[model samples]
Target chain A: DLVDTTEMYLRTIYELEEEGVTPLRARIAERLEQSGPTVSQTVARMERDGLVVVASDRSLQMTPTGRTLATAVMRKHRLAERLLTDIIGLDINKVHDEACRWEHVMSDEVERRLVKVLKDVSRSPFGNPIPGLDELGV
Target chain B: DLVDTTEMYLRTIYELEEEGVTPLRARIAERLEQSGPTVSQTVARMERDGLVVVASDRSLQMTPTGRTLATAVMRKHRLAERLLTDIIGLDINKVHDEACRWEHVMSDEVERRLVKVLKDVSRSPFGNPIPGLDELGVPGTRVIDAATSMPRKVRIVQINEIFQVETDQFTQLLDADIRVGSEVEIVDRHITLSHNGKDVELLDDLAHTIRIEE
Candidate 1:
């Protein structure tokens, strides 16, 4: 089972990296609204779990396995946002928070079915492109 | 904000009551797959929180406010199941468990919009009618489960909530394209539908959980 908290941190790091921001513990704490000590402890635990590595510059980077998990979760999140906004008619602004909770619970089969259902939907409600299978390269 | 565990317990109690089972601590523990002492502790906490009351028989009963919260959560759960099985094309059997987690997290605003988007759906995937919001004005259209050999122009309404607990059956239904609002033609005990301009075949048992309108 993927730890929800750990997935959140991984996604935060991935998003920060996407935005060209160095994911230091402080930056992670700010993004997650967690304390610096909590971020530090979780980062250490993630390293122990082989999900991440800390560089000499104090920046956090996802290991290959961590990146795979992060991108899968991020894909789920974006697909959920599309479902909320496109099918349920939720406001684009509100879908992100709802999708955050949804991403953790979606099964892999359900994710595949969702892709089929929403056919050809490539972008989230926020206009961000969703992670694709090719991009993950499995 | 209500804790997710608390909400889960309350929903379980509500479901037990719906099934005519007395919500005893033992039963709650059994349903939750939790230990006896754990259930006792949580029930005591719920009593202190005014969410439940212990009857003379030691069966648990929801307080009025507790019932209110349970109904709201159930409403969300059923509505989300509809969204998943109906709009999102998830197998009916697969959505109930998915909706269980969703029930605790959806905001009131999201619930309202879901109700609007679903139009007049009044039941869960398992044929259990959703509670609360009588003011939503039930549609006059008669919704019925499709039987084998029935050929008609129809739209999918909802799936039976029972199927949501079973992954295999759900996946089978998904493979057949038996989803909400998909036009279906049942012929000779086989479900036939057009998806992406190709004909698909489904088993007759799939019709058991499917509610449709003519």
Candidate 2:
């Protein structure tokens, strides 16, 4: 039952990890454009929910379940980007923010069908491959 | 500035009005499947926001601004329904619910391009002609009943609205390539048609549910 805001945090953390950035609370706040106190509160809650662990070095690490959730949301976001830019002919620069909104609402069934409809699109307009899609078995 | 839920309420009220149902608080709740108190509270908020006016008879009326917002949402929703069922090949029965979520998120630019991509689709898959399409410079196309036999080829324009609730019939229509833009030639007035080099037999009743154009 992850809400949209929680999913956004997971996605931001996942992207930080991909860029080899240390996932500190300040860094998460900066990336998400959220306040430091709010980030700390959410991080604490996520830890209580077993989604992340705060290391002794003050870095963040995603739990296995958190990684799985991040992967699914990231997959949806990237596929939506492809759908918007490639199919709908949206400008590439504008698709990311729109995809962020779309990711939260797209159902798994729609995602599966989208994969088939967009057969040739394997990467987002940013040249990033959609996560979890290789193993999606669609 | 309206949130998705507020937009949904406005759109639901608009549809209820189109169906000739007075947009009372209770009727809004019934159509939205929300509780009475929730609808009452929301309607109060909507009035505060100048989106609706409560009439003397306790019916609801949209302000001009409210109508504009509602029409925009409905247009996005209907266009999304067409995209889902016609191009993406999603089940027609499943598209309405999906479009409800999409209606709130599609940007104005995306909506414009979607209209271009879905060329000639003046109506939703549910057979409701999109509101304000003519103002967008998209002409309304003639939709003929599918029961008529013609020597020339005809393209499917839209399915009648009733087919949306009849899942079995809708599925049958999809399986037979009776969807929008599918080309068919009438082989028999009440029995069969040629589609994609195959003959599809149709019930006389089912034939009436389809609309086509030359």
Candidate 3:
């Protein structure tokens, strides 16, 4: 239900790449719980927007702007998960779903406040590295 | 089940109808801050999708299925507004637009969990009914404004340590001897700490930073 699905694609590709998983169309479709045709249509649209590149081997990769935006979106989501889990006390298993909603919902101001509130927090509740925060150990 | 633009349209239309306004295409365009055939064309698509119906007088209405999804979006929107303002202490000016984004992004399980974590209270901090939970919540909003009435109780969530306002004017409030966790009655445009009755007025922005819950 979104134009914001564009961010989801960028986010998913990076997530797969982060895991050393191949960023294929099928894999992205599976991760996003979307249909293959829809994913293909969106991927083409994203390529037209220069947000992603598809290889001969069918793996997906982000363009520079894509990577930048994806990283920001992904960071906010993980940070949101940390907030919900550590402070709000949502069920641990439930943080991911709640976080997905918060990804795009988060405003720059709110994210800045989060950076303040979680100054020392470098990792997500699930132990994933919060990219861009150098304290997040590689 | 659709696109972001579509979800926004439904939420707008949803509020229009619930507020007893005539649901017309022109009204939709105005509220959405769009012009031309963009809204016209989208409304056509909505009809084709069976989410809406256009009457002979050119007024619009949601189908039952449309109403279902619209209410769902509305519910999540108000709940998100509440969380951002009442519990999380965001600036009141930012909550509505921010909540609009959260509305479409919510999932069923997330909304269900959100309701419980939010204590299942109904009305939003902005004081509008949150759609689904009418009987549960009657909580007050964070700031004192037209939405707030006199003789309400409020807890000071923060003194706004950021203090972006003019020093002299704001220092006067610091002198009033209020502390965090102070329970004050909102008597003025929403003012005066409970302890001393200093009767201090608030700068609009400063007032926004002073969060409270009733």
Candidate 4:
């Protein structure tokens, strides 16, 4: 299956936006650990797919569709982190790294069930919201 | 040299309990991603270790000794989570996973130092308590909860809202004085804004979850 690497970039941007910070290419590059050209090229593809709209001024932002999917990924990612710690009983320090991989692998149904189970939880065990869960139909 | 897997299980049990869930074998299996046999064996080992004693009527209930270690693990786990997220720039979402692993690997000195940092923090970016500074610590443990411990001070360490609560509301809470080490007192617990402010009390439980050091 083809990987949506651009979506990952967009999700990162979405998280940065949530933090009240504007997402710039350099910042994205820093988080993704990619070179400038790669980030630029991937962003270009995402722009073509309508997943993002890079401004002429060089600032980056996710389009509506992009934001929805990015937020979903973020929400799923946060919930996965909770499952790792609260359910799986994994070490809190290791859960994040493990969830990084598991977040992408969980089925939508599993995500739904997890969201339901952890619905009342305020913060993932470490203290962060499970993103999209707070906003239904995002 | 017998590796005390019972301690590991008790730690897990304590964490589950803190989350307001009872410790059941099925839940443990689900959480640990192990088969039924694995949980059974671990529970058996814990029973043997005196770290956990199964209840005669309710099999899920833990013995007093089991609970003490479980509470200790819970404290350590929360402390570790607070340190990784607050001290390091690890994303809040990502911090728990890392803290879960680090709780087992960290040294007592490391936890102590981290607890010190948590105690000193006046506010966290998310408005959650810094763990060691929480008011929920065991009486003799050199830690205090921000709510009861620092009664005169206003510290907004974490902002806790229910999952699926609404992003706008979530964002609004974060925009407030909440941070990892903030020291602000609650001048008003029910400051009613004209629009809507009924669900503010949930934030209180969120504060309780945060443990702060004395």
TM-score for candidate 4? 0.38
* Highest lDDT model number: 2
Cα lDDT for residue A126, candidate 3: 81
Window of ten residues with lowest summed lDDT in model 2 chain A: A129-138
lDDT, candidates in the order shown: 0.75, 0.78, 0.73, 0.58
Residue-wise lDDT of candidate 1 within B1-214, one digit each (tens)?
3377778899999999999898888888998899999888887888899999988998888899888888878887888788778777777767888898888777766776877888566788788888865522232122323443555455666656566444455654566576777765544445565343444453444444566543
Q: DockQ, per-model, please?
A: 0.27, 0.31, 0.22, 0.01
Q: Is the docking of candidate 2 incorrect, acceptable, medium or high quality?
A: acceptable
Q: Which predicted model would earn the best TM-score?
A: 2
Clashing pairs in 3: A2-B4, B122-B137
Off by over 4 Å in 4: A1-4, A134-138, B1-214
lDDT of 3 by residue, A6-123 (tens): 8888888888998999999999999889999999999999999888889777778788888888888888898888778765667676689779868877876676656666544578
Model 1 segments beyond 4 Å from truth? A134-138, B134-214
Candidate 4 lDDT score at position B26: 84
Worst 10 residues of 4 chain A by lDDT: A101-110
TM-score of each: 0.73, 0.74, 0.61, 0.38
User: If candidate 1 were superposed on the true structure by all CA atoms, what would the RMSD be?
Assistant: 16.7
Q: Which pairs clash in the backbone of model 1?
A: B93-B163, B93-B164, B125-B159, B125-B160, B125-B161, B126-B160, B126-B161
Please state the Cα-based DockQ of model 2 relative to the true two-chain complex. 0.31
